[PDB]
């Protein structure tokens, strides 16, 4: 009875579609990472170049993608983006299949001309897939979620938290499953599994999106050389000036600045851990702890929003993250690299930074969701994504400039500083919304 109603409701179908999409995306990302680390060796330069390419492409095309999402029907945009992403992933999987089958041959076919051709083709396909994924995220997590929630902020916060939990769980699980598949068999079987899973997921998510559109009737109403390139530049300029003129500019600015960091767990931090003499089991349990603290951050954000308010929740999350970051700053000056105390303190700071950062991210995304007109949602969200990946591009450039372990600690400090800047900027926004009642939570008395 009730179980069937819950499994038939729009929220569950949306959750299922998002879970399938993120599982497939994470599997494909791990496959590409394995290809890069094995065929070309453990080179940070190539990974940084790939990140540079994807970040720059999104930076340039974000306004265009947002405008396209804004000026078209909701069902068509989502279906087209999903089809494009899944087709791109399938083609990349087939190409990786053919590359992996001829391992020794391609390693000795020529000086590397065919190898570089395969690299650039994979990079282009991955760039297209990332653009499609960004379009899907903009059209689903910013447009459809609000319409499904309606006039209920608690429901919107719960959906955002559940999406974040699904993302964290798939991030911690799917790489392990696909790695076990690869290690029990061969990478070719892994790529085949990627391709088949993405095709079946394409079909299932198409059907699920149709069902979601049918179940919510409020999604059908929407309120609104040089000559060829004249209009995209106008769209870019208009989107950026509109984003700059928005009153929630500071919050998105700080969220973008928060991406300028090396204190994650999918970055060269794992390389530093390996260079400090830590086994893989320690890394696995640390990743599990990071996922657990992400879930804790989501639930803490929900409770803090319910009890205190959005802006004060953001302030509390920022203060927590800053405390974690100063713990890391204390860590870097301890004895160690320019013996276990330094790495232990750094990792604890990283995990607690993860929980604080997830709380802050949820606060900022809700603020952007509920304070933007529905006729400019896509363009503002696209410009926000563009700034986030601009900061990611800067991070990749910095990692390229200082690859040696010895300077890594210095890099850490820079990251910390930028985080502080972001929160400081958010603080100003808080003032512009709260004035002198900043440190007062609860009903007035």
């Amino acid at each position, epitope marked *: 009875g009730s179980l069937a109603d819950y499994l038939t409701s729009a929220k569950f179908l949306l959750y299922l579609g998002h879970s399938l999409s993120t599982w497939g995306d994470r599997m494909w990302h791990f496959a590409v990472s394995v290809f890069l680390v094995e065929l070309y060796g453990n080179s940070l330069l190539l990974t940084a170049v790939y990140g540079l390419v994807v970040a720059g492409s999104v930076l340039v095309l974000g306004a265009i993608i947002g405008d396209w999402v804004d000026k078209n029907a909701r069902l068509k945009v989502a279906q087209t983006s999903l089809v494009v992403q899944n087709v791109s992933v399938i083609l990349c999987g087939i190409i990786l299949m053919m590359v992996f089958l001829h391992k020794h041959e391609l390693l000795t076919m020529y000086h590397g001309w065919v190898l570089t051709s395969c690299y650039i083709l994979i990079i282009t396909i991955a760039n297209i897939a990332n653009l499609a994924s960004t379009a899907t995220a903009i059209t689903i997590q910013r447009d459809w979620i609000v319409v499904v929630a309606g*006039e*209920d*902020r608690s429901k919107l916060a719960n959906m955002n938290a559940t999406i974040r939990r699904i993302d964290q769980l798939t991030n911690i699980l799917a790489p392990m499953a696909v790695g076990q598949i690869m290690t029990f068999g061969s990478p070719v079987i892994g790529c085949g599994f990627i391709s088949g899973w993405n095709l079946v997921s394409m079909c299932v998510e198409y059907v699920l999106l149709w069902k979601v559109y049918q179940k919510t009737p409020a999604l059908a109403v929407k*309120a609104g050389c040089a000559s060829q390139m004249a209009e995209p530049f106008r769209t870019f300029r208009d989107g950026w000036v*509109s984003y*700059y*003129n*928005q*009153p*929630v500019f500071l919050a998105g600015m700080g969220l973008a600045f928060l991406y300028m960091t090396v204190l994650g767990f999918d970055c060269i931090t794992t390389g530093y851990a390996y260079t400090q003499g830590l086994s893989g089991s320690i890394l696995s349990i640390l990743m599990g702890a990071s996922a657990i603290t992400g879930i804790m951050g989501t639930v803490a954000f929900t409770w803090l929003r*319910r*009890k*205190c*308010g*959005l*802006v004060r929740t953001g302030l509390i999350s920022g203060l927590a993250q800053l405390s974690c970051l100063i713990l890391c700053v204390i860590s870097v000056f301890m004895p160690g690299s320019p013996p276990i105390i330094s790495v232990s303190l750094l990792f604890a700071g990283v995990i607690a930074a993860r929980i604080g950062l997830w709380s802050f991210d949820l606060t900022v995304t809700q*603020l952007l969701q*509920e*304070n933007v*007109i529905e*006729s400019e949602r896509g363009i503002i969200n696209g410009v926000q994504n563009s700034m986030n990946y601009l900061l990611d591009l800067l991070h990749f450039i910095m990692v390229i400039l200082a690859p040696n372990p010895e300077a890594f600690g210095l890099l850490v400090l820079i990251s910390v500083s930028f985080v502080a800047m972001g929160h400081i900027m958010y603080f100003r926004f808080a003032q*512009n*919304t*709260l*004035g002198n*009642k900043l440190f007062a*939570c*609860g*009903p*007035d008395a």
Partner: antibody, heavy 120, light 108 residues
Framework: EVQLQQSGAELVRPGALVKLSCKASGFNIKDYYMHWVKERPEQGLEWIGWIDPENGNTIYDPKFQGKASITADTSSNTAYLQLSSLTSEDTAVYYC?????????????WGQGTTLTVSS | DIVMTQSQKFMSTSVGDRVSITCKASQNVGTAVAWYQKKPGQSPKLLIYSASNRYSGVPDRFTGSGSGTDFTLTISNMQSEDLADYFCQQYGSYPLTFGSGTKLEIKE
């Protein structure tokens, strides 16, 4: 049909306590921000403050800080404005307004307005 | 704070002529200006939001324009039902401030 009804025809002596109500029909005050606006006769429109009925966070304008107090009741779906230390300058017309978010584009629905006159 | 100044307080007009009402900001509010129209003895209504977007139900003769510091509301063809008081409100920053208002009266 979203509607907001208010009390009316308030006559009060200087230096007393005044309570205005704002009952909402067709929606829930919990999902919106409830604002209060004052209009002095032959004058402009002034902003008093806003309240969030979900949690009780109330923010006021600097001028109407120690004089006004905004409360809300979700069960009865009604906002309340409390005015204290009344003076002859406070005779005006008060409106109850609805806002979507912190920086919502507009006040879509307004109340009928309550006329407050203080006299001797 | 942000002070909104409307220059003219009484604009004399005739039926069937374009009417322009100006609104000036003390700082750069961006595109956050909403125009409200109110007849005498009734609650204020909604005409334009975000300085360019017209609300659902407003006649097409109302057009908003401007950005940054200067904003203007234009009526293409004045009718007898458009004689009221119009004011501009910003929402870029708190506390919210309203305009002084402009009253439209016919010519004779």
């Amino acid at each position: 049909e979203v509607q907001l009804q208010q009390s009316g025809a308030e006559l009060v002596r200087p230096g007393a306590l005044v309570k205005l109500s704002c009952k909402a029909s067709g929606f829930n005050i919990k999902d919106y921000y409830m604002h209060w606006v004052k209009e002095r006769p032959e004058q402009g429109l002034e902003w008093i403050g806003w309240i969030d009925p979900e949690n009780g966070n109330t923010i006021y304008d600097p001028k109407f800080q120690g004089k006004a107090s905004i409360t809300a009741d979700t069960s009865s779906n009604t906002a309340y404005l409390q005015l204290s230390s009344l003076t002859s300058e406070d005779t005006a017309v008060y409106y109850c307004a609805r806002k979507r978010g912190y920086y919502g584009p507009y006040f879509d629905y307004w109340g009928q307005g309550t006329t407050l006159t203080v006299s001797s | 704070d942000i002070v909104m100044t409307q220059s003219q307080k009484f604009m004399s007009t005739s039926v069937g002529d374009r009417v322009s009402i100006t609104c000036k900001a003390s700082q750069n509010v961006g595109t956050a200006v909403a125009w409200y129209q109110k007849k005498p003895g009734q609650s204020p209504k909604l005409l334009i939001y975000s300085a360019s977007n017209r609300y659902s139900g407003v006649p097409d003769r109302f057009t908003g324009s401007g950005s940054g510091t200067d904003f203007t509301l234009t009526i293409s063809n004045m009718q007898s039902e458009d004689l009221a008081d119009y004011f501009c409100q910003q929402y870029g920053s708190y506390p919210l401030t309203f305009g002084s208002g402009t009253k439209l009266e016919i010519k004779e």
